[PDB]
């Protein structure tokens, strides 16, 4: 009942990429910042010759709401 629906944080990824098909949290070493893990399985990547390989994005909560791709594999 206590979820804030007045001012929720809206994160977005590339359109048509199914951004949000899988979601999770990120809590790394020690008392650091926290992040949102969002899946976009139909997302086009920079991988050579790979069409719609998909990617997992690291979005920052701290401020600014900006998302950064996680480089899992750059090869073709």
């Amino acid at each position: 009942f206590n979820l804030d629906v007045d001012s929720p944080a809206e994160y977005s990824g590339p359109e048509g990429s199914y951004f949000g098909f899988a979601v999770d949290f990120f809590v790394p070493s020690a008392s650091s910042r926290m992040f949102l893990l969002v899946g976009a399985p139909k997302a086009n990547t920079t991988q050579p010759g790979i069409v719609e390989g998909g990617q997992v994005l690291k979005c920052d909560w701290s401020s600014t709401r900006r998302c950064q791709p996680i480089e899992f594999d750059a090869t073709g």
Partner: protein, 305 residues
């Protein structure tokens, strides 16, 4: 002798202002107010002096504010946190400027709040009430104080007064690298929203009371008795005797000759060039050939100032 010079220009200003305003004599009517003038026109006057960012007659300046986040501006957009949408009503636009030809300058002015960092802005126009077409671009600088900018959308406003479309608008998003520009979701942090002084479209048009500098394309086809640009082909071998300039061996520099009667600044308004064009030359230096370009040589147009 120094006070006699100043008195002659004033009488040229008198004849200028009356000609620019199309007035024969200053008016004299009923008088309001004995205190400070109404702030509806002081907001216009305070917005016209606010510079941050042919036709010598006067232009009547009027403005129109935008629509709130109410009035159906919420059924279509709202939540693109990296963009700002602005809408106007045509029923009030074609009232300040009846005929689209009267419109002279129509610049869209906004209000900046953020003072830290620098961001990149792209401007679009409303098409098919869904599609947006590119317009202009402008980079912004980290000014410590609230800054006031302006975008010249005259060509857009002119076409909108010819159409019967009673609903139009603009869009201000950010740079697309192939989403930046706005980092807050309130939409009211980077620009003023649902608040006074919100973005307005400053208009500068010519009244119906009024309506009711050509170059070589007129100065060479007609015989002017006034300030017209005359033709003059200058040869290096023939008119100068210079064989040290390989290219070119002659060009059209031209000149301005003509009177300019009734208009200020100088004691005698002269026939001076308005537009000039550079000339590339080729000459040698001992054994080294240098291709250089002189600035402002070819006289295109001529004005009187």
């Amino acid at each position: 002798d120094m006070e006699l010079v100043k008195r002659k220009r004033i009488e040229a200003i008198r004849g200028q202002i009356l000609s620019k305003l199309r007035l024969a004599s200053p008016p004299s009517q009923g008088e309001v107010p004995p205190g400070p003038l109404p702030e509806a026109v002081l907001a216009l006057y305070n917005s016209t002096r606010d510079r941050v960012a042919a036709d010598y007659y006067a232009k009547e300046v009027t403005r129109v504010l935008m629509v709130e986040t109410h009035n159906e501006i919420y059924d279509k957009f709202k939540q693109s946190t990296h963009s700002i949408y602005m809408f106007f009503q045509t029923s009030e636009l074609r009232e300040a400027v009846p005929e689209p030809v009267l419109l002279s300058r129509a610049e869209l002015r906004l209000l900046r709040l953020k003072l830290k960092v620098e961001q990149h802005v792209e401007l679009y126009q409303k098409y098919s009430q869904n599609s947006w077409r590119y317009l202009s671009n402008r980079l912004l600088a980290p000014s410590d104080s609230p800054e006031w900018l302006s975008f010249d959308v005259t060509g857009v406003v002119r076409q909108w007064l010819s159409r019967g479309g009673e609903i139009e608008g603009f869009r201000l998003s950010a740079h697309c690298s192939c989403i930046n520009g706005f980092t807050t979701g309130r939409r009211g942090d980077l620009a003023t929203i649902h608040g006074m002084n919100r973005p307005f479209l400053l208009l500068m048009a010519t009244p119906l009371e009024r309506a009711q500098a050509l170059d070589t394309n007129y100065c060479f086809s007609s015989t002017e008795k006034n300030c017209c640009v005359r033709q003059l082909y200058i040869d290096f071998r023939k008119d100068l005797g210079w064989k040290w300039i390989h290219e070119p061996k002659g060009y059209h520099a031209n000149f301005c000759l003509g009177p300019c009667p009734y208009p200020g600044a100088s004691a005698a308004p002269c026939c001076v060039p308005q537009a000039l064009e550079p000339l590339p030359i080729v000459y040698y230096v001992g054994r080294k050939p240098k291709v250089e370009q002189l600035s402002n040589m070819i006289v295109r147009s001529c004005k009187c100032s």
